[PDB]
Nucleic acid binder design. Sequence first.
RNA 1: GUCCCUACUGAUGAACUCGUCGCAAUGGUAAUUCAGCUUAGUACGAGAGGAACCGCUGAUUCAGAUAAUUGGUUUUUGCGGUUGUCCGACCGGGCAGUGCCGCGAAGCUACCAUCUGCUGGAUAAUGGCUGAACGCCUCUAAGUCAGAAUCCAUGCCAG
Lengths: 55, 62, 113, 62, 356, 135, 246
Amino acid sequence: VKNLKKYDKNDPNRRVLARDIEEANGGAGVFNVDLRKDWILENPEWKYDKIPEIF
Amino acid sequence: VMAPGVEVEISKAQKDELILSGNSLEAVSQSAADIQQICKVRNKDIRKFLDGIYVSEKGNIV
Amino acid sequence: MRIENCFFCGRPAWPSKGITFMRNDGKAFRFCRSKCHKNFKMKRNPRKLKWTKAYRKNAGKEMVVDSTLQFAARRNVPVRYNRELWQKTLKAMERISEIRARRERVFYKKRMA
Amino acid sequence: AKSARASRIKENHQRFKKNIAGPVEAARLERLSAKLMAIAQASGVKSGKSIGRKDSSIVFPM
Amino acid sequence: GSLAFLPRKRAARHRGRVKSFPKDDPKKPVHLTAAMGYKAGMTTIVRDLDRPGAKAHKKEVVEAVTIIDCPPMVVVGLVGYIETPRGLRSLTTVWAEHLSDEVKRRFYKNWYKSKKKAFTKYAKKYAENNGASITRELERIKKYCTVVRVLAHTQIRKTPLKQKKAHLMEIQINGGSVADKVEFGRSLFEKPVTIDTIFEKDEMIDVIAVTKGHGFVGVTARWGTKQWTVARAGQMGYHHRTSVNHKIYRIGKGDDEANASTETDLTKKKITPMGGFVRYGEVNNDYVMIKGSVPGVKKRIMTLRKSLFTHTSRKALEKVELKWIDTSSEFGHGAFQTAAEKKQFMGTLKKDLQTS
Amino acid sequence: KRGAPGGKLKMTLGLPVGAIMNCADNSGARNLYIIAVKGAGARLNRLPAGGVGDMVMATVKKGKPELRKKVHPAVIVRQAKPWKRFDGVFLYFEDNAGVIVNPKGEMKGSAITGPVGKEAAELWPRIASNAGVVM
Amino acid sequence: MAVRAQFENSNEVGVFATLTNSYCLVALGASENFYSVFEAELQDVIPICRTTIAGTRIIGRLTAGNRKGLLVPTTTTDQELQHLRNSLPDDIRIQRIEERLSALGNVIVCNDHTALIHPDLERETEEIIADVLGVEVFRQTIADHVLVGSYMALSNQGGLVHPKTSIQDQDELSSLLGVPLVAGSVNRGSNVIGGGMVVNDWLAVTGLDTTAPELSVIESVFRLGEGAGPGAINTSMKNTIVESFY
RNA sequence: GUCCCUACUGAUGAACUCGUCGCAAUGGUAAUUCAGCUUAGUACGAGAGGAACCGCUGAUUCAGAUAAUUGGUUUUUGCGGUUGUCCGACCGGGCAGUGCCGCGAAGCUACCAUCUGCUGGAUAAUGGCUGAACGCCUCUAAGUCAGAAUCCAUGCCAG
Ligand SMILES: [Zn+2]
């Protein structure tokens, strides 16, 4: 936190930010969020896998 | 969409200005009118909101 | 998703099937059929009605002490996703199901001895 | 509320048709027609090349 | 009621007709417009919804879906129409050779006592060097027609129905020159065409059917009350309807043996409910699984056709991730997906000991 | 601003106009008498009705005399008539119950006795904050 | 630092957010404005999880936890639980509790050393909280309001309490906790502090209707921003508080 | 203190050999309002306050269907309990115009349940382009551009 840089909307090389990501990839009612993008598993390829629920 | 035979350019002589030239005066003028009509304010104040595309000069290329 | 169990009779309660009763004390009452709901509303004892798992367990019509039933229970502590873990779990579920079938066959044989 | 037959609503529908559904349905049709093609390819008078005659009224009988 | 569904009359035909195919342009690839199927029933599912902007976004929702038994249809003909100042006119039709007994039953009304003599001379026209005349008919279609349709019939003897008479209809070919469409149909002669070949998953379609009859019913139910504008008593039900925008959620292959299995439910089970569809039976063929309610009773003939207009909604551009399909009994309050699950839940029984 | 909630999905309405319900907060009111609902569409001979999460107008039939003085707005919290939630779950409560709220959506009381409807908690943040059991 | 934000158009950020010293939970809905302000304030220092519990957006009033653990009601589904587990590092322990008062964010306030609970919680829930959160659990009613999670917000630097709390009770709570406490309001006169504000040791998010005097009180008591200091309220800002909230 | 013809609404139908697949003259014609999200605490504003176009998601009414689920309905007189009387008693049953009660499939229903409701052209008020009448000027006289939930049609029902 003390090693961070304060966010400002005018700096050229600012942080990307999810607002900018959704504005680039559609809008507020069109962007589809990937809920598994931040999944921290053991093997990174196990993301986007259909976990069985009923057998 | 301009009529066939009318060329429109962003000319670098003055700022925020657009040149619309051609051979058919009717087509040129109608294209200018179409742009001016497409950019018109609604439900605002005419005396306070003063933005749009307007015909500034009329004449000949040569 | 999840497979629920009927509060009254214990049959598998699948999505859409049944009515859920929310009592004012804060506990939820999930039923699998209108039969179960109406029995609960007329306040009969599932421990007395003979077509219920409560009655059958009370009267010892089913096996209740076995590792094949200790292996499955509700989990309140999540485990991090692991493909080997889920696949091996599925195979273990198959093994457990057939072992349970054989044990229940033996139990009902012993009851009908 | 804008009517379902409003001109602005029709124009918005036209844009949506032309910029999303167009490409999506084009790809879908390409795949489907590929499958159709897979299943499908799974003297003039005396030969039929010259299309001749097989075997109330508009005019008054004379 | 609505003055748009009047003269409130019984449907003139049981099959139900398309009445409009989507407009055709040569730039698209060659394809067929419509298909046929038989209503088997309807069931319950759970879909992981991805509707950005909805409160059920990234949530599981329970939906009702209608199941249509769709055995592959057989192409047996090709019809060519011309444009005239009075409309479209069927210039000529050329059939296939070796027609089936079911389509010949369609042609006949008392099939049992009849000498089954339909299209025999036409087959002789193929075989006895009148193929010149047949090619002449094909070339007439090539050089004079503007729209081409293909004659196709269903397979009752695969559908679990007491009926034996099939159903013919013309499916319009779109996307190409008339020559390309003629070659396509001629090559499609004597070949089965599948529903996964005509449609596919995620696609909204239009369903043409005859909604169920209820006989002479008064105004209270006929219109919904407390000159043609005044509510009158008469026939209510058995009405031709074209219902639009129904999402195709799944196409099951019939021979898959795991039609009802999803990537979430690892149960090797098929679409047919435990005990069979009530009043219908089992679905052993290709089946179409579509959202919502659809006109028609069980085992009724149904027409499935492509949308007339390119879609304007995000519900038509969405993927459908299925979680599970209900296979419990429709004959009562069923709670078991499979007989194996029922046996495992209830244990072994007295008749089990007596038989074993 | 009319107290019509936004984004609410369809549910079966269980409390019509002229309906007596319990009061779930410690505001001192015991029962409420729904006389009007917000967002209703006037069609001939139909009595308007409201479901869990709808704002209504009610007169306190019994309770605190300060509250038995004016027509108060109220968000209805519990519904005895069964309704379906989009997860396919049909459910109902033991009684019909609501809480006194201002037109902005803020409660006069400080606590809610009994459980709260999930739709009401989602629709009104203050009820979600003053609720103890949410199902 | 103290920032003002709105979830969708609502000033109650505590209903839709849960901020701790090792993770942040954000309600999922429509746009990414709320997640984005939280991310711009926490640029990947700690994970942020877009989560739903029981198909609701009230995750802030439904979940309680600190940097050592997270507790969710029994109504939480296995999918949501697994989402939380995959999103959060293994150094945080997540559990579902079978409490009748399923409004966990309303019945529990917890800093990283102590927790204060609704007096009618079950004993088993008490040991579960004391074990998972790793805190000393005390039962108390704040300003005679039995929902501590709704009527008080706590951090390891301080704690802001219902505006109508007695001085004796405030002193007793301060002694029992170990941090400074101040009686203040959020969102221009709102008493629901927990529902209108989320705070950790270095970040607070309030509603957009939070006035300047009360935002300065928040920054001061929670030591957010330069010097801060709970004492400055009693020295530098008295005139402001007396003139504004007379 | 004076059951008939016809209109309308549906249903059959002779002759054109029976049948299958079609076309479409003409007639009918359908959707409606609100809200929420983003735009945006933005434009605008001293302050207090505070929009809109595109894009997205729901709800009211209306219309047409449908029954997976969930209620209701029971002559399934299907099963069980129970009152009075009777068949000598048990068992098994009759009678009480369906004795009474509980559950109850199937069918039927229900904005008490669920699904679906679609696009081109030409216009009015009006705003324009070129340009006479009238050596200025002028949207009009010749010519022409846009534009309303309007008009005519497609989609839809009948044939
Ligand atoms: Zn049950």
